Amino acid sequence: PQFSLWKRPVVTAYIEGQPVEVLLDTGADDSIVAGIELGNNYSPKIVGGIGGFINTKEYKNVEIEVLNKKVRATIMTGDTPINIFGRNILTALGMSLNL
Amino acid sequence: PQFSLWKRPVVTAYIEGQPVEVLLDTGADDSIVAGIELGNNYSPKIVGGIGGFINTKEYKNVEIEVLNKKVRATIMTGDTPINIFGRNILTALGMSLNL
Ligand SMILES: CC(C)CN(C[C@@H](O)[C@H](Cc1ccccc1)NC(=O)O[C@H]1CO[C@H]2OCC[C@H]21)S(=O)(=O)c1ccc2c(c1)OCO2
Ligand SMILES: [Cl-]
Ligand SMILES: [Cl-]
Ligand SMILES: [Cl-]
Ligand SMILES: [Cl-]
Ligand SMILES: [Cl-]
Numbered sequence: 647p648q649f650s651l652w653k654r655p656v657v658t659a660y661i662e663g664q665p666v667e668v669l670l671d672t673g674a675d676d677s678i679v680a681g682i683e684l685g686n687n688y689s690p691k692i693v694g695g696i697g698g699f700i701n702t703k704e705y706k707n708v709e710i711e712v713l714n715k716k717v718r719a720t721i722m723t724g725d726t727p728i729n730i731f732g733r734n735i736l737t738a739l740g741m742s743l744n745l
Numbered sequence: 746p747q748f749s750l751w752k753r754p755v756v757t758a759y760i761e762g763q764p765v766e767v768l769l770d771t772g773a774d775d776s777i778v779a780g781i782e783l784g785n786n787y788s789p790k791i792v793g794g795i796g797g798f799i800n801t802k803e804y805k806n807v808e809i810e811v812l813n814k815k816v817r818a819t820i821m822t823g824d825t826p827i828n829i830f831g832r833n834i835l836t837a838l839g840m841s842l843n844l
C-alpha cells in the first residue's frame with residue numbers, strides 16, 4: 647500500500663476483533679485508541695500531545711489486523727480525539743516514509 | 746530519502762531562513778512551529794490534539810527549505826511542544842507513506 651498524503655492516511659483495523667478507524671501517524675511514538683475495551687490487564691502510562699498530557703492504559707501483546715497484516719503490539723487506550731497507529735506499529739508492519 | 750520510522754523522522758528545516766528541527770508527521774493535517782515570529786498578517790485559529798487545544802496563528806506562503814527542496818506553504822505558529830511538518834508540507838515535497 648501507498649498513501650500520498652493529500653488525504654489523511656486513515657484505514658480501518660481490528661484490535662482484538664474490535665473495528666476502528668485509525669490514522670497512520672509517523673509523528674506518534676505510540677499507538678493510542680479511544681473507546682475500545684481491552685480489560686483489566688494494563689499498566690498506567692502518561693502520554694503527552696499538542697495540548698498537554700493524558701493518562702492511558704497500556705496493553706501489551708495485543709492482536710492487530712490492519713493492511714492485510716496481523717501483528718502483536720502495544721496499544722494504549724485513552725482520550726485521543728483520533729485513533730492513531732504510531733511508529734511502534736508502523737515499524738511492525740514494515741512501513742516507511744519516502745521522497 | 747527514506748525514513749524507516751525506527752526513530753522519529755526529524756530533520757532540519759529553514760523557515761524564512763531560520764533553522765528549526767521539525768518532525769515529519771503524517772498524522773498532522775497542518776504544520777505548526779514554535780519559537781518563530783512570522784508577523785502581523787495571520788489568521789487566528791484553534792487546533793486540537795491529544796491533551797486538548799491550542800491557539801495558533803496561520804501564515805500563508807511561507808518560504809520553507811527542507812530535504813533539499815524549497816517550497817511555499819502554510820505554517821501555523823503556536824505553543825506546540827514540538828515543531829511539526831504536516832501533510833500540507835509533506836505533499837508539497839512529494840513524500841509518501843508506504844507499506
Ligand atoms: C493526535 C494526532 C491526530 C494529531 N497530532 C499530530 C501527532 O503526530 C502528534 C505530534 C506530536 C509529537 C510530540 C509532541 C506533541 C505532538 N503526536 C502525538 O500526539 O503522539 C503522542 C502518541 O505518541 C507519543 O509520541 C509523540 C507524543 C505522543 S497533533 O500534534 O495534535 C496536530 C498537529 C497538526 C495539526 C493538528 C493536530 O490539527 C491540525 O494540524
Ligand atoms: Cl488518493
Ligand atoms: Cl492521497
Ligand atoms: Cl486525495
Ligand atoms: Cl477479527
Ligand atoms: Cl509513563
Ligand SMILES: [Cl-]
Binds near residue numbers: 693
Ligand atoms: Cl508520550
Ligand SMILES: [Cl-]
Binds near residue numbers: 775790791792
Ligand atoms: Cl485546523
Ligand SMILES: [Cl-]
Ligand atoms: Cl530563495
Ligand SMILES: [Cl-]
Binds near residue numbers: 647843844
Ligand atoms: Cl511497497
Ligand code: NA
Binds near residue numbers: 785787
Ligand atoms: Na493584517
Ligand SMILES: [Zn+2]
Binds near residue numbers: 650651652653
Ligand atoms: Zn489522494
Ligand SMILES: [Zn+2]
Binds near residue numbers: 660
Ligand atoms: Zn481477527
Ligand SMILES: [Zn+2]
Binds near residue numbers: 656667
Ligand atoms: Zn474518518
Ligand SMILES: [Zn+2]
Binds near residue numbers: 675676
Ligand atoms: Zn512512548
Ligand SMILES: [Zn+2]
Binds near residue numbers: 675676692693694
Ligand atoms: Zn510515549
Ligand SMILES: [Zn+2]
Binds near residue numbers: 704720
Ligand atoms: Zn510500554
Ligand SMILES: [Zn+2]
Binds near residue numbers: 774775
Ligand atoms: Zn487544520
Ligand SMILES: [Zn+2]
Binds near residue numbers: 808
Ligand atoms: Zn530564499
Ligand SMILES: [Zn+2]
Binds near residue numbers: 759810
Ligand atoms: Zn538555504
Ligand SMILES: [Zn+2]
Binds near residue numbers: 824
Ligand atoms: Zn508554553
Ligand SMILES: [Zn+2]
Binds near residue numbers: 647843844
Ligand atoms: Zn510493500
